[PDB]
Amino acid sequence: SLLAEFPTCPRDEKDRPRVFTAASGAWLTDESGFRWIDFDNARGSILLGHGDPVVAEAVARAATGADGTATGWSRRVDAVLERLHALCGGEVVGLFRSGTAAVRAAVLAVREATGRPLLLSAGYHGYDPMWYPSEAPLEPNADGVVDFFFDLGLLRELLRAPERVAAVVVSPDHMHLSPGWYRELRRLCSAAGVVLVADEVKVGLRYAPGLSTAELLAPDVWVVAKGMANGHAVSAVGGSRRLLKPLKEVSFTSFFEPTILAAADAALARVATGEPQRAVREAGDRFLRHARKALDDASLPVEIAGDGTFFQFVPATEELEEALYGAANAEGLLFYAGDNQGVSAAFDEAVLGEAERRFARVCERLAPYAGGEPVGDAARYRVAWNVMDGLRQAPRDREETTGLLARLL
Amino acid sequence: SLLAEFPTCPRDEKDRPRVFTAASGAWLTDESGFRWIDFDNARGSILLGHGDPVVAEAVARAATGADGTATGWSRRVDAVLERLHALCGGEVVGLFRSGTAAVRAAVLAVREATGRPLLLSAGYHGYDPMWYPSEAPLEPNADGVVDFFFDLGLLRELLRAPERVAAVVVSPDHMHLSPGWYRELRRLCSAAGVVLVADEVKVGLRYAPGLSTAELLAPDVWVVAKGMANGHAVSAVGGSRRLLKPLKEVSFTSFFEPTILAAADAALARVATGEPQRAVREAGDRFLRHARKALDDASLPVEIAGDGTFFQFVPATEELEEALYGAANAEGLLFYAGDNQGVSAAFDEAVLGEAERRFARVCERLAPYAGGEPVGDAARYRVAWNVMDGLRQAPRDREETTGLLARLL
Ligand SMILES: Cc1ncc(COP(=O)(O)O)c(CNC[C@H]2O[C@H](O[C@H]3[C@H](O)[C@@H](O)[C@H](N)C[C@@H]3N)[C@H](N)[C@@H](O)[C@@H]2O)c1O
Numbered sequence: 146s147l148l149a150e151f152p153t154c155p156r157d158e159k160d161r162p163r164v165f166t167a168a169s170g171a172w173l174t175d176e177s178g179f180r181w182i183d184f185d186n187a188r189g190s191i192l193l194g195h196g197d198p199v200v201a202e203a204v205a206r207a208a209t210g211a212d213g214t215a216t217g218w219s220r221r222v223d224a225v226l227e228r229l230h231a232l233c234g235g236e237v238v239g240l241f242r243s244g245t246a247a248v249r250a251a252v253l254a255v256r257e258a259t260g261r262p263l264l265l266s267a268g269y270h271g272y273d274p275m276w277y278p279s280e281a282p283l284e285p286n287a288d289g290v291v292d293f294f295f296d297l298g299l300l301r302e303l304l305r306a307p308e309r310v311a312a313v314v315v316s317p318d319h320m321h322l323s324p325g326w327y328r329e330l331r332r333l334c335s336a337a338g339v340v341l342v343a344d345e346v347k348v349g350l351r352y353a354p355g356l357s358t359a360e361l362l363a364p365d366v367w368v369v370a371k372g373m374a375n376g377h378a379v380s381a382v383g384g385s386r387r388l389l390k391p392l393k394e395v396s397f398t399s400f401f402e403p404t405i406l407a408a409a410d411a412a413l414a415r416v417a418t419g420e421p422q423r424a425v426r427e428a429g430d431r432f433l434r435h436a437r438k439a440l441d442d443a444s445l446p447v448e449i450a451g452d453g454t455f456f457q458f459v460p461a462t463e464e465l466e467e468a469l470y471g472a473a474n475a476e477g478l479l480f481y482a483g484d485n486q487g488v489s490a491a492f493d494e495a496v497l498g499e500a501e502r503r504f505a506r507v508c509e510r511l512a513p514y515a516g517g518e519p520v521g522d523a524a525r526y527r528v529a530w531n532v533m534d535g536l537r538q539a540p541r542d543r544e545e546t547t548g549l550l551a552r553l554l
Numbered sequence: 555s556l557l558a559e560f561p562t563c564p565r566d567e568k569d570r571p572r573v574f575t576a577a578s579g580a581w582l583t584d585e586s587g588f589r590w591i592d593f594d595n596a597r598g599s600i601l602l603g604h605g606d607p608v609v610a611e612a613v614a615r616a617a618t619g620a621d622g623t624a625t626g627w628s629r630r631v632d633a634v635l636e637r638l639h640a641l642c643g644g645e646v647v648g649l650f651r652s653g654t655a656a657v658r659a660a661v662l663a664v665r666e667a668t669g670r671p672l673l674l675s676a677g678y679h680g681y682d683p684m685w686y687p688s689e690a691p692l693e694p695n696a697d698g699v700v701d702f703f704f705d706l707g708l709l710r711e712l713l714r715a716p717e718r719v720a721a722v723v724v725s726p727d728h729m730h731l732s733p734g735w736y737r738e739l740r741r742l743c744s745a746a747g748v749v750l751v752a753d754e755v756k757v758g759l760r761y762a763p764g765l766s767t768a769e770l771l772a773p774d775v776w777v778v779a780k781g782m783a784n785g786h787a788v789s790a791v792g793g794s795r796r797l798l799k800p801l802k803e804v805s806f807t808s809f810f811e812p813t814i815l816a817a818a819d820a821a822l823a824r825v826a827t828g829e830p831q832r833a834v835r836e837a838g839d840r841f842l843r844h845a846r847k848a849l850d851d852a853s854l855p856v857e858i859a860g861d862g863t864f865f866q867f868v869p870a871t872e873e874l875e876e877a878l879y880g881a882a883n884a885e886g887l888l889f890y891a892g893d894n895q896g897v898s899a900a901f902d903e904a905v906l907g908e909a910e911r912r913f914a915r916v917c918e919r920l921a922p923y924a925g926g927e928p929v930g931d932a933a934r935y936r937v938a939w940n941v942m943d944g945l946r947q948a949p950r951d952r953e954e955t956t957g958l959l960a961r962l963l
């Protein structure tokens with residue numbers, strides 16, 4: 146207990162972190178020698194697979210100084226910028242050292258550029274205190290952030306006074322929000338004349354070789370990170386020259402560190418082909434068909450939201466959800482507990498076959514829960530909240546919305 | 555023109571970044587094949603030297619999968635936390651992705667833990683807007699920060715109402731502030747009952763295996779970064795468990811990324827022994843003896859502040875400053891222009907012998923500046939302001955302090 150932070154990671158029954166010695170492709174080794182198949186994948190930042198051979202060679206080389214120096218510019222800086230710009234659009238691009246740092250810099254630049262105070266937010270934007278919850282729903286926090294919890298009725302209300310709004314900033318979820326959700330969000334922002342920031346730290350580059358919301362939102366500013374460097378310490382922002390002009394005041398010491406630029410340039414190259422995204426979709430979709438039949442044949446009341454790119458178990462009770470991850474653990478399948486499961490491209494037939502096999506065995510372990518009452522909406526809203534930090538799309542009136550927020554906050 | 559940021563880096567006479575294609579030890583090669591001896595060394599974060607073989611090999615093995623996974627905890631997390639704790643003291647340790655992020659998190663944690671609004675600051679703390687200047691000297695900015703510019707007179711004033719003060723946060727400079735200055739700062743903060751945060755992002759682990767101000771300040775909370783990983787993207791905060799409890803709320807996606815953890819463990823192993831810091835001190839002091847002698851023999855009105863660990867040229871005039879770096883640029887000595895020079899442990903006998911010959915050539919180019927009026931205090935103040943973003947220690951009354959602030963802000 147030297148560690149001052151509480152990092153999100155695999156934890157065991159005593160909530161102590163699982164210690165992993167090694168990993169390659171889709172497989173992990175733990176400290177007891179027990180081997181796992183990884184559906185966490187550093188929260189979906191491992192798009193390609195652990196230890197990816199070709200990224201590894203580019204990073205190993207950069208470490209020797211052969212591609213440049215942390216002292217200053219290298220043409221790999223130009224290549225990473227150029228790639229991102231091609232993939233995501235906009236006029237300008239900036240690089241940062243986490244998703245957190247990127248989203249904060251982007252929204253503060255917009256606030257400065259527009260001269261307006263309030264940020265209207267849905268979703269998680271990172272650990273920084275600027276995003277901490279207000280004393281009550283719909284009121285601005287200490288840093289001028291109002292959370293609207295992906296409720297478009299609440300957003301529409303807020304946008305009836307757009308003079309005070311620097312930007313709307315949204316973290317997509319494609320498991321729990323439909324395409325028409327996003328189009329309504331875009332229509333409302335455009336009618337109000339308000340800047341739209343897509344926080345694609347998680348979803349950017351994974352659904353497509355580009356922004357998952359490039360056409361759905363056509364955002365004024367974007368942020369990506371998890372998809373861009375197979376796990377390495379980099380994020381990016383882009384959009385219009387005028388709104389990001391304040392980013393000119395950003396500099397940081399490690400900006401030119403070559404191994405990160407190596408990893409980003411290698412990983413982005415594949416990202417740009419479409420293939421790893423196809424492979425993950427196709428692979429996790431295979432695994433999903435299989436998992437859904439196994440839960441069904443087993444009479445287990447667990448729905449699965451989403452798709453091969455990201456999916457989430459939605460069990461009918463919290464008891465069952467815990468048992469589920471209990472059994473998965475017992476079988477060497479590493480899920481990100483309660484959150485979204487994101488396979489990597491290292492999910493070939495061998496892995497899929499074993500994972501399917503290990504999932505059947507999870508269903509076997511779970512047979513005491515066979516025939517429980519099927520999934521209701523309270524479970525769906527609970528489980529979606531854990532992944533999105535706000536409300537899944539479903540029909541509701543204002544009273545229902547208010548009740549949900551009271552319950553879940 | 556894709557980059558939205560304006561990174562600090564070596565820039566040519568047209569203000570364009572120099573392009574470096576490779577580096578090894580003390581030496582850089584640029585896009586034209588010109589070879590440079592590096593005194594900038596990623597703003598001092600390259601303590602060991604470019605492409606340090608042991609670190610590079612730690613990084614290579616970690617990029618394979620064989621030395622931990624981004625998905626979660628590893629034995630190298632413990633080794634890093636343990637090492638920092640041993641070198642720097644305190645009860646807990648936290649890891650971050652840049653000095654900016656680390657100092658922001660540290661100070662916000664102290665603000666939350668004490669419950670008091672104001673941060674009293676000297677020095678540079680990172681690019682974040684929380685540090686932007688106030689409307690007037692001695693007024694807090696919009697984020698509750700009041701800059702005292704290293705003037706203990708001004709600090710005493712601000713310490714007259716300490717109930718409102720969460721911390722004093724200071725970035726040391728050992729070229730322009732004496733040991734007695736630190737002791738008095740220490741005294742002051744203790745009498746006022748205020749928390750002292752030493753921002754050792756630059757100086758930590760470089761003057762000694764641990765904190766430069768360990769004895770002088772005995773700070774409540776410390777921050778280090780540039781010393782810990784031979785340029786790789788990590789920083790650390792440590793100190794009181796109580797004061798850093800708010801850091802429990804920190805998590806980021808790349809926390810377990812293995813190449814950075816390996817680089818840090820390998821670098822900190824070397825740092826703990828005291829050897830690289832001794833090598834740097836001795837190598838730099840040797841260069842300084844030669845440089846001071848060459849300047850004097852040439853009748854050039856340029857002093858040198860500092861020592862082998864970090865030194866700064868202090869030219870009598872801005873014209874002569876620009877001529878100095880122009881001449882150094884022509885001879886392939888890469889100085890961090892106007893700022894501090896920080897050699898690495900790869901500065902061996904052969905590097906020093908060539909740097910001496912190059913600096914002799916520099917002084918020959920500056921012949922036309924021979925015999926100019928000797929350095930005055932206005933020059934010393936302007937030059938020191940560039941490295942510390944505040945006032946070098948020297949006798950002043952308040953009016954003169956005020957006067958300097960008006961001049962240099
Ligand atoms: C849209 C978005 N914007 C910025 C960030 C910050 O990026 P970074 O971690 O690099 O600083 C993330 C980081 N994502 C990590 C996790 O964040 C969320 O998890 C939060 C979680 O939802 C929240 O309730 C809890 N307080 C902490 C936890 N880290 C998501 N539910 C999860 O799918 C994600 O994997 C993000 O998803």
Ligand SMILES: Cc1ncc(COP(=O)(O)O)c(CNC[C@H]2O[C@H](O[C@H]3[C@H](O)[C@@H](O)[C@H](N)C[C@@H]3N)[C@H](N)[C@@H](O)[C@@H]2O)c1O
Pocket residue numbers: 396397398399562597598652653654655657677678679680681725726753754755756779893894940941942943
């Ligand atoms: C004490 C301290 N705390 C946090 C940080 C931020 O760390 P990071 O860059 O990793 O985010 C630094 C970063 N240091 C980089 C430079 O910062 C200052 O340079 C500033 C410079 O003084 C300032 O005027 C300018 N606007 C930006 C410039 N980077 C120092 N003069 C220099 O010696 C340094 O090498 C630091 O020195």
Ligand SMILES: [Cl-]
Pocket residue numbers: 704705706707947
């Ligand atoms: Cl003083």
